Amino acid sequence: LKRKITELCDKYIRGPNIILAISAADTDLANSTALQASRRVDPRGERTIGVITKMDLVEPEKGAAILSDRQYPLKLGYVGVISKGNLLASINRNEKNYFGSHPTEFGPDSGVSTGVMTLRKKLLQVLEQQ
Amino acid sequence: DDNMMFITKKMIEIRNLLQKVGQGSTVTLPSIVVIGSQSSGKSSVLEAIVGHEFLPKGSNMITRRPIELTLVNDPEAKVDYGEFPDLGLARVTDFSLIQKTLTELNQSVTDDPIRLTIHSPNIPDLSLIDLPGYILKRKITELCDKYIRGPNIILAISAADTDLANSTALQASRRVDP
C-alpha cells in the first residue's frame, strides 16, 4: 500500500523487465487518478503496457479519457478491462456483452482497445520479443 | 457566534485582495482545497453542489482550471445571486446562466483559477477552491500536489474503487499530511 513496499517495487521495476501497470478508474472526489511509477522508471514508455481496471462503474466518457490519452502516450498502448464453474468463459461473456451498453464510447473504430483476449495476445507478442 | 461569522468574512475578503495583488507576488491566507478520485471527484463536484445550492458542475469538465469559490453570509439580501469578480458589478440570478458562462470557461481552458462569489442567506461564508480530481495525468497531479503541499485545510472526498495503492484522494492527503 504505502511505499516502503515501494522500495521493493522500484527495484524490481528498474531492470529491463516488461512492466505491466494497472490503474483503478474511478473517483468520488475529483475523480480517478492514473499511473505514475511506470513513467518514473520508464520515461519513453517503451517497455511498459497499461491496464485500466474497475472500469465497470464509470461513465464511458470516463473510459475514453482513460483508455485513450495522448497526454501520456506509450508504445504497446493501454488495455481497459473489467475483471471480477466455468468462470473463465463467463468473464469472457461479460466483456463481450458490456461494451454494448456504451458501444460508441468504447467499440469499433474507437481508438481504445479492450477485453482480456486482445490484451493476452499483446502480452504474448511483447514477451516473445523482449 | 455572529462575530465569528463576520471575522471569517473580513478574512476571506483580505485573502481575495492578496490574490488580486498577483500570483506568487505576495503571501496569501489558507483556504479549503478539495480533491477526489474519478468516482470520488464526481461525488466531489456533486458534494460541493449540495453544500450551498445547485450550481453548474460535472457533465464533461476539462478540470484544467481551478475554481476559487468565495462565499458570503447574505443577510439583507433575499435573492440567490452569484457574481463574477472579473465581470464586476454583473450579477446572475439563475445558475443556468452561470452554467453557460462557467462551462464556456471550461471548454475555453494559463492555469489561472476563475474566482467566484455567491450570496445566499442559507449558505455560510466560506472559501473553497475546486481543482481537478485525479484520473499527462501526471500534470494534473503536479498542480494538485502543488496546491495541497501548502498548509491549506484540505478537504478529501471518497467513494472510490481503486486498489489499495490506487485510491488517490485520501492517499495523497496522507502523502502531504502525515
Curated annotation (Swiss-Prot), chain B:
It is found in: Mitochondrion intermembrane space. Residues 36-43 are annotated as: G1 motif. Signal peptide: none annotated. It comes from the Eukaryota. GTP binds at residues 39, 41-44, 58. Residues 62-64 are annotated as: G2 motif. Mg(2+) binds at residues 43, 63, 130. Residues 130-133 are annotated as: G3 motif. Constitutes the soluble short form (S-MGM1) generated by cleavage by PCP1, which plays a central role in mitochondrial inner membrane fusion and cristae morphology. The transmembrane long form (L-MGM1) and the S-MGM1 form higher-order helical assemblies that coordinate the fusion of mitochondrial inner membranes. Inner membrane-anchored L-MGM1 molecules initiate membrane remodeling by recruiting soluble S-MGM1 to rapidly polymerize into a flexible cylindrical scaffold encaging the mitochondrial inner membrane. This is Dynamin-like GTPase MGM1, small form. It comes from Chaetomium thermophilum (strain DSM 1495 / CBS 144.50 / IMI 039719). The gene is MGM1.
